[PDB]
Amino acid sequence: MVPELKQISREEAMRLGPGWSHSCHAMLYAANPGQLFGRIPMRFSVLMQMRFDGLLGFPGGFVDRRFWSLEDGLNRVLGLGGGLRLTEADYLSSHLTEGPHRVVAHLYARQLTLEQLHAVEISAVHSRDHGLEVLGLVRVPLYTQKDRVGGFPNFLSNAFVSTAKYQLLFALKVLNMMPSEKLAEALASATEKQKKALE
Amino acid sequence: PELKQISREEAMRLGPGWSHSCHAMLYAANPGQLFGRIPMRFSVLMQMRFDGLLGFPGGFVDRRFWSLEDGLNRVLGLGLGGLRLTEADYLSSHLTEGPHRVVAHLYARQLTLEQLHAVEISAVHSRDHGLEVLGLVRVPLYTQKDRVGGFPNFLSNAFVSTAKYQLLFALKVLNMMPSEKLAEALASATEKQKKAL
């Protein structure tokens, strides 16, 4: 169980006054036919990143609406380097963050080929933001090993930007990349792992 | 969780029933400053593994046929891309928490920040990228004004237990961070984790 964030419509988000900050982040993913150890289907690979503050999050950042539309802003704030362009067709959701500052978090999601996803990873290591704001990209493992913790459940027990962890689970669910009951199982495994470490 | 440190010689005398792992801690002094005011001090490479945990580059070495160095370098050739370590880079051997019989050997090498970046570029092109290795990360060793941003948040991630111990061990014995500062970062990380729940 994660703390539920309030979802609002894009139209509502556009009506927000100047006292609201807007963040735009991108969930880039690819179908992945690979099989770990020749037997565990990887299904999809999703990109996240280690941030300067020691937490996992998505590529992106704050967008100043005095100057930019959400899409123009996002494409400018993507510390991936490259030629990838996101459009309003890739817009997925807007959620109000936990605060206390007034922030709406916009999520864009785009499916790429696995070769294109790798090109993004290569671009990122050469990016101006690498080693400053961004400390490295990681692929999310969506599979679970036989021990029932290796892979996705262990991954979910990492330290996230709270908004990004919610957005990841939200997107996996609404984009039909993972059944909800499987997400619940991985999250339960991660949360119990965390609780028993703290004992 | 204190691991028992033993000598290379002791490790070899445990016998054929023991497995050996070798991992490398690659790091660089880093003159950068976060926000132009927070000294970065050093950058250390770790990686996201296939099992969803942070660890160091490296893996199991079959000591029946391989020296620790040759074994390590072959695993690094597939997973980092051709950097080669020597016996001069050997740092420590620890018995891992049981019940499995594993001795964990740690190698450490200081690189320039330029050489460290070359390793990161090599890694994204390596054979193991997207299979056993899911991406490299730099450790943030600084702590932000809120006293959690940076190193304490980082320590609240999920690690191979042995690797987390090895990181803290190496930061101490290599004089990269004072013991009391490490203790302080760990305490903050724990307090973060408990309030997260």
Numbering used by the authors:
A (entry chain A): 5 to 85, 87 to 204
B (entry chain B): 7 to 203
Copy the relevant paper text.
The tumor suppressor p53-binding protein 1 (53BP1) plays a pivotal role in orchestrating the choice of DSB repair pathway. Central to the 53BP1 function is the recruitment of 53BP1 to the damaged chromatin via the recognition of di-methylated lysine 20 of histone H4 (H4K20me2) and ubiquitinated lysine 15 of histone H2A (H2AK15ub). More recently, a Tudor-interacting repair regulator (TIRR) has been characterized as a novel 53BP1 regulator, which directly binds to 53BP1 Tudor domain and blocks its H4K20me2 binding surface. In this study, we report the high-resolution structure of TIRR in complex with the tandem Tudor domain of 53BP1.
The crystal structure of the complex reconstituted with mouse TIRR and 53BP1 Tudor at 2:1 molar ratio is determined at 1.76-Å resolution by molecular replacement. In the complex structure, a TIRR monomer comprises seven α-helices (α1–α7) and seven β-strands (β1–β7), whereas 53BP1 Tudor comprises two α-helices (α1–α2) and ten β-strands (β1–β5, β1′–β5′). It is worth noting that the binding of one 53BP1 Tudor to TIRR dimer does not block the Tudor-binding site on the unbound TIRR protomer, suggesting that two molecules of 53BP1 could in theory bind to one TIRR dimer. The complex structure shows that the N-terminal region (residues 10–24) and the L8-loop of TIRR are engaged with a concave surface of 53BP1 Tudor, which is delineated by three loops (L1, L3, and L1′) of 53BP1 Tudor. While the N-terminal region of TIRR engaged with the L1-loop and L3-loop of 53BP1 Tudor, TIRR L8-loop mainly interacted with the 53BP1 Tudor L1′-loop. TIRR residues I12, L20, and W24 in the N-terminal region, together with residue L101 in β5-strand, engage with 53BP1 residues W1495, Y1523. In brief, TIRR residues P105, H106 form hydrophobic cluster with 53BP1 residues Y1500, Y1502 in L1 loop and L1547, and F1553 in L1′ loop. We observed that H4K20me2-bound aromatic cage, which contains 53BP1 residues W1495, Y1523, D1521, Y1502, and F1519, undergoes conformational changes upon TIRR interaction. In particular, residues W1495 and Y1523 display the largest conformational change and completely alter the structure of the aromatic cage. TIRR uses its N-terminal region coupled with L8-loop to block the methylation reader binding surface in Tudor, thus abolishing the access of 53BP1 to nucleosome bearing H4K20me2.
